[PDB]
Amino acid sequence: GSEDFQYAIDMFKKFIEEAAASMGPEAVKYAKEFLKLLKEYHKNGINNRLLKIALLLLRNLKKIVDKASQDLWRRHPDLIAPGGIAFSQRDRALCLRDYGWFLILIVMCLVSGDKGPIEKIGLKSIREMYNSLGVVPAMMESIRCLKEASLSLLDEEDANETAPYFDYIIKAMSL
């Protein structure tokens, strides 16, 4: 149980260290602030049922990003054709990396289970990281692909439990 939460924490801390340079100092600030809240929620038994889903998603991060990007590239093959923004090795690697980072941040939102801190803290981290990254090809479409890839690994009730978290970030980022 508590090592399941520590595995979540270890995933989020590894991401923050790895992305610190590329994401905002403000983005790091809000991500660390979110992480502190997740620990407080855990210590007080708050919204505990979301962790089991998040753990499945965290254990399958690369599978999800690969599935979501192959989906993305079949829907928009121009992205990887010659002349495409994701045709080059450097930029395609940057796309897959950035998509994985947005997925990790979305999974942090899921662990909180709470639309308050998601808007006040989680979404600020996502927005600051997007600002620091700059051009992220097919940003909005990639998030819908990450959602459908993530839900494809879930049973029925977990899927309908999880979809509204992807849905809130999708609409919030659409502005």
Explain briefly what this protein structure is.
The PDB classes it as de novo protein. Keywords: De novo backbone design, monomerization, near-infrared fluorescent protein, DE novo protein. This protein has 175 residues and is mainly alpha-helical.
Output the keywords.
monomer; 175 residues; mainly alpha; Globin-like; 78% helix; globular
Describe the structure.
The chain has one domain: Phycocyanins (Globin-like, Orthogonal Bundle). With 175 residues, the chain is mainly alpha-helical. It starts with a helix and ends with a helix. Helix content is 78%, strand content 0%. It is classed as de novo protein. Keywords: De novo backbone design, monomerization, near-infrared fluorescent protein, DE novo protein. The assembly is monomeric.
